[PDB]
Symmetry: C3
Subunit: 249 residues, 3 copies
């Protein structure tokens, strides 16, 4: 039963709905970090908001800008296995930013790329993180929706702030001493941020059907942080009630 979702290639008025936020656009629309197993290789690559398309391939130009080459990168802990997989990255993939912050992926490599996206999990009726999406060579699909993300943010944020109030009353449960309770400032933070991050492995997938159980076990993957989505999540976090000390009495 499908943990591995296949995404083969399918050949082929934003003036009525305002921007999700009046907030000014970030200087970089995303930042990419390349990994080899559980070790990060190289520096984090920042893509300016002016460059709506960024390519990540196995070539060697270091010039940066709108192309992140992983071919010239060194790693003193690189194994023979990692060398083999680095052989097939080739043309790699393209990451394209549409609208205010939507992201599309185009696989230019001759080999498939495996992706982790909450958006693609929803579209598949799967639960968050309970699926690895395989994008086939030459395929071109949408992997992130800003609106979908924003709606999920507000939902999950509200949920957590309520569960905090729950635990707060579940223990105000004796009586009684002079004890004050307060909600941890930062609930669900590490859970909400995952909604603004994308991850993808080259050539090799992971999961049930595979010998690798997490992306951390794959030879070469990248983690993409979506800055616009992160600004919104920050905005959201700042619209919640301040953790005011509460006497349980």
């Amino acid at each position: 039963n499908g943990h591995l979702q296949h995404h083969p290639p399918m050949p082929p008025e934003l003036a009525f709905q305002p921007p999700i936020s009046n907030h000014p656009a970030p200087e970089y629309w995303c930042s990419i970090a390349y990994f080899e197993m559980d070790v990060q290789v190289g520096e984090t690559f920042k893509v300016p908001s002016s460059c709506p398309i960024v390519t990540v391939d196995g070539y060697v130009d270091p010039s940066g800008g709108d192309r992140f080459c992983l071919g010239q990168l060194s790693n003193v802990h690189r194994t023979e296995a990692i060398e083999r997989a680095r052989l097939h990255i080739g043309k790699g993939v393209q990451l394209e930013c549409k609208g205010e912050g939507d992201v599309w992926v185009r696989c230019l490599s001759d080999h498939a790329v495996f992706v982790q996206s909450y958006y693609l999990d929803r579209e598949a009726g799967r639960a968050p993180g309970d699926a690895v999406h395989k994008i086939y060579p030459s395929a071109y699909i949408k992997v992130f929706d800003l609106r979908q993300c924003h709606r999920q943010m507000q939902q999950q944020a509200a949920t957590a702030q309520a569960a905090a109030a729950a635990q707060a009353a579940a223990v105000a449960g004796n009586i009684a001493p002079a004890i004050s309770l307060s909600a941890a400032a930062g609930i669900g933070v590490d859970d909400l941020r995952r909604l603004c991050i994308l991850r993808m492995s080259f050539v090799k997938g992971w999961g049930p059907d595979y010998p690798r159980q997490s992306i951390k076990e794959t030879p070469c993957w990248i983690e993409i942080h979506l800055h616009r989505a992160l600004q919104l999540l920050d905005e959201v976090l700042h619209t919640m009630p301040i953790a005011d000390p509460q006497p349980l009495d």
Copy 2:
């Protein structure tokens, strides 16, 4: 011996050198245990105040948000800690290169500082200073650091007559600050080093390092 110093809240000359002001008055590196997480944050001399909180805005400038950073080695203990960083702290740069800390967080912050060691009358590096929420304390005096480095290098340049001869890594420590969030360390705690705490940062003071470099050229080791 009162290794942990308590700093609760208490509501209220020309440049040392002509050396050109730095492009950044400091650099901050976030750590979770003994692993550095994220890239090094550099603060422009233009932004005298910088905020290090546990939120998620990835923008630079004067706000370093630790909430969005990832760590493949992160554990439950660390995630549980990051949970209480909240508003974090503010580092302020006064004068040529003095530094103040303002705990905005709901929880205490533990600072390692030679200036505070000297003020508390403790052996250098033999103390941890607990900064309480809302407290606004001075954690670094440039002028004093400058006298310290000169005199300390001066004694090492003479200790060569012959240990007493200290190296560059010993002196650079005068220009660095370290502080833990939520969890403290020392004899009163299960952790003996800041390197064992779940969340901490290391601050490099550029103006202080420039003066140090200037000193290492006149008083070589």
Copy 3:
């Protein structure tokens, strides 16, 4: 046998635009990278890497200030002797010279110096003596070597194709898009250890076993290699037949 080589004191290749930086410098202690990668602007042809502490950066990279929680007594000892370190200079389009300013020698790994010394590619350690000023990299020579080496790789790859052909037509055979890329890029990289050397004549058998070394990425060179890789015949799967 001579693994250790002694060096005591004694028209554009492309219309492609110059790089933003001419080189990237990464500092290492043993097998751990310390600090962030230093990038040198094309405007600063000379960069100085020493053991002092100015963090100002720009055209001077000071390793004295950098921290490393995994550092040991042995490494602190070694960082003591870097002192004025070395000085890397870029002449013309992409030639690199080195000037040892340290009181101690520097050990360089340079395919170009291996080529001049008459030793197997990368099978030698070049010891630069205090005050020495030598050319450690030749752009022209590198470019010429990249092309021939890339051409050879393709041939050997297409050779392992006609091989698997000497077994069924129901299957298509294809070559990796990254054949030889790892070997080719090393020609555009320089590595050097301060104070301690490595090799048969030493207790340390590789640079990653040394206390403090740096890896330099030559940008103009890497650009030329990129164009070369892009002029290679696209990978077209051929049926076994």
